[PDB]
Amino acid sequence: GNFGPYGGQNVPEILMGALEELEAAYEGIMKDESFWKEYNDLLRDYAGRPTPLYFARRLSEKYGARVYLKREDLLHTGAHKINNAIGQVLLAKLMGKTRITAGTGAGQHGVATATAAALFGMECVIYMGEEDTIRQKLNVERMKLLGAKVVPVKSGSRTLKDAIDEALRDWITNLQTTYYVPGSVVGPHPYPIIVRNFQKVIGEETKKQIPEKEGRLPDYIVACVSGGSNAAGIFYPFIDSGVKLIGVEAGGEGLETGKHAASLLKGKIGYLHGSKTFVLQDDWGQVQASHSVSAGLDYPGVGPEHAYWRETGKVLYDAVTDEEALDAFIELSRLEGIIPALESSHALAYLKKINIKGKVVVVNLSGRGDKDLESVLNHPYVRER
Amino acid sequence: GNFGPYGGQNVPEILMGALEELEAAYEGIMKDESFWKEYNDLLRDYAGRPTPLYFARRLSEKYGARVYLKREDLLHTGAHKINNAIGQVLLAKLMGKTRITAGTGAGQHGVATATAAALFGMECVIYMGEIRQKLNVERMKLLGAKVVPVKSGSRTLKDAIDEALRDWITNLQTTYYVPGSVVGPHPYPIIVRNFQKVIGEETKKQIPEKEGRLPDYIVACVSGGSNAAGIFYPFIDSGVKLIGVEAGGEGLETGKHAASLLKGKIGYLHGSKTFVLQDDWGQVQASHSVSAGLDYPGVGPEHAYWRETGKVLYDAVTDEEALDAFIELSRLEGIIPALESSHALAYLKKINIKGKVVVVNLSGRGDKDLESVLNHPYVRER
Ligand SMILES: [K+]
Ligand SMILES: [K+]
Secondary structure (H helix, E strand, O other): OEEOOEEOOOOOHHHHHHHHHHHHHHHHHOOOHHHHHHHHHHHHHHHOOOOOEEEOHHHHHHHOOEEEEEEHHHOHHHEOHHHHHHHHHHHHHHOOOOEEEEEEOOOHHHHHHHHHHHHHOOEEEEEEOOOOOHHHHHHHHHHHHOOOEEEEOOOOOOOHHHHHHHHHHHHHOOOOOEEEOOOOOOOOOOHHHHHHHHHOHHHHHHHHHHHHHHOOOOOEEEEEOOOOHHHHHHHHHHOOOOOEEEEEEEOOOEOOOOEOOOHHHHOEEEEEOOEEEEEOEOOOOOEOOOOOOOHHHOOOEOOHHHHHHHHOOOOEEEEEOHHHHHHHHHHHHHHHOOOEOOOHHHHHHHHHOOOOOOOEEEEEEOEEOHHHHHHHHOOHHHHHO | OEEOOEEOOOOOOOHHHHHHHHHHHHHHOOOOHHHHHHHHHHHHHHHOOOOOEEEOHHHHHHHOOEEEEEEHHHOHHHEOHHHHHHHHHHHHHHOOOOEEEEEEOOOHHHHHHHHHHHHOOOEEEEEEOOOHHHHHHHHHHHOOOEEEEOOOOOOOHHHHHHHHHHHHHHOOOOEEEOOOOOOOOOOHHHHHHHHHOHHHHHHHHHOHHHHOOOOOEEEEEOOOOHHHHHHHHHHOOOOOEEEEEEEOOOOOOOOOOOOHHHHOEEEEEOOEEEEEOEOOOOOEOOOOOOOHHHOOOEOOHHHHHHHHOOOOEEEEEOHHHHHHHHHHHHHHHOOOEOOOHHHHHHHHHOOOOOOOEEEEEEOEEOHHHHHHHHOOHHHHHO
């Protein structure tokens, strides 16, 4: 469970039995034909896979390139999170667990988890941070409609990190009945491998679709990176393929302003939620609060596989600011009629940061941005626009 | 363009010119395979077609049936309306039009139209009636469409369509009018149905690979009738029990509903001879429904013909019953259905389906209806 020096199982000792039980159960389904049949049948009929590779003609003409969008926004619940939530709650039910817990910031992973819990008829308790938006109010009503319990997180600054903290305390105090569902590729082994292996269907589908459109592998593949599950899903089948893989972290107000979530670019090696990885820290090793106009990227850590990919040069990493992501949000809505998630808008914004004239670019559209409409229109950068 | 005695072009004389040029342009693409190739490529890559046919295991176990759901909620914009909007604006591009106009009530059809207009890079002007509406207005503005609030009449979907047709009449040189359903003057009912029949043609090729036989029932909600006619047309005279469900509102015998085929009378609405809710003096009556998508006093002429010749059966369910189906599918399957499609799901309690294979048309997702369902007095009590 080590990606070079990163990863590991840096957890309280009482969690070692659950991690070893999870690792053994996951190793059993690796060859189980029945599991992958029930899972892939749900990905097709319940989630909507395979998602199409859409040629954005008007976006391509603006940049003088051939830009393709991997349409993960067309999935059920409207984000890639549904791919990981279905497979993990299914694994939980197969392991005999009767309760599901998870943490969420705005409510996206909470909705995807509560959706899979209602599909499999399991108890679901979601710990959610505080934000005064119609988006979160809708997610609360979604999760309550799906039958899940929502516990407003009051610890810390009531962020996604604080919600994950409360969900982990729930897991430890309910280890007999509860399965913990992480939202990204951040966590103790084998969680980063489990989440990535559930998301790599994105990159596998992409590898089969792009030669039908261009007769060759793409020149670039761009995806937004916070924890890194959607980027790892599309990057993994293309590792060491020669395709330029670019992960875009949240630059916030600026990489030198102290208000961002670029764990790889500005973080230090540390421990967060079970994994040794790059975390935003001060000089004394204390985790720092992240910031981003995108709630999905507002996380101070990054998956250990991305820290390994960055070190070995297999994936290139950069960041874009809040304003650049807001501009890409409006740009795709006007040019293609697709309202992208503010998370994926960071990857779309990077189309301006690379010389793509005449290049074939695939952008991972990780979700739709209807949840972000009020945040975008009320932002002072857009209001002044 | 007559479905027996229904249909026609009952319009003012000024509209006859654009309707003849629109019919003429539509006959040209009837055999043009380059048109339908571009249309189907967009349906696949842009809208997300083909949509899956999902076996609802927990829902099937509740009634003893094998209930399947045609997942139109997984389309772009989250409703079947996108199938029609993409095809009409594609037709607008071939005709040389550069402006798109349409009418909408809560804004569901306005978003689908503004989405297709942005995809083709065209000007879009939407006429709309009075959080779901606020969000839809923000969508249409983010998509680049001009939203004109409707002030005439009761400011409903019917009044918005009137202003949109008024807009089309004034600018019939550069503007293509996009209807939302299979209601309107010829050739619009056939154009919309021919764009929506991809649903039934997909369902016809999917249910064999899942049951070996043809389905026993195919249920779908009906207002104007675009999503129902889309899934019904490839199954007409096939033996399958085709059932359309209209909006019963507060009750069929309450005067607060939208069941045009059940409680309406023959008449004219927006250019089509069909069944319209009206009083004993021929004046059109206002419709009511907990779902804004079904809040329309008319029905498509092809549905009036199907009901008369017995090729499709029609019924209606109450607001309270649609709210139960809304909560039921969310709790049982984790799929929040549209309050429109919830009328079809509620019909699973009104027929014997024990051992029968049923296909319900999930016309759209119901995240737009979350605030309306929870703040309703019937749901607030429970
Ligand atoms: K981060
Ligand atoms: K009606």
